[PDB]
Amino acid sequence: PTLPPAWQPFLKDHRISTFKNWPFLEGCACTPERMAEAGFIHCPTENEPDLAQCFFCFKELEGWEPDDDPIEEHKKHSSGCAFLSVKKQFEELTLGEFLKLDRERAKNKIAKETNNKKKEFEETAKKVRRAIEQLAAMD
């Protein structure tokens, strides 16, 4: 209401709130506060119940261990992510700055969708190619 849904993930408090059933709490370095401070949203599936995604660059990481530092993991796995460079707090950004960042996020989202479609297409290509080789082979 006060901020549009599509922009809520920019907010730490929103992000923390996504961690309804995170296994790692007090005593662990990767607590929800720390995951959220690093950009991660919680995306648990059947197969991967610890799945986390950067809201900004869309990198997905599973297999969290208690001693994992979310910032170092984000730096390691997705070094190019602009969000890691944002030193200012949200209220302190200028709208130009904020709009610039949301453009970059939109480009990141497209890049991710695109890279996905590519890999899915390449896999379909492999199937079809195989099927056609088999037929030439029988022949």
Binding site: E48, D50, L51, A52, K59, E60, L61, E62, G63, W64, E65, D68, E73, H77
Partner: peptide
């Protein structure tokens, strides 16, 4: 942690 798979 490591990257998602499949």
């Amino acid at each position: 942690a490591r990257t998602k798979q499949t």
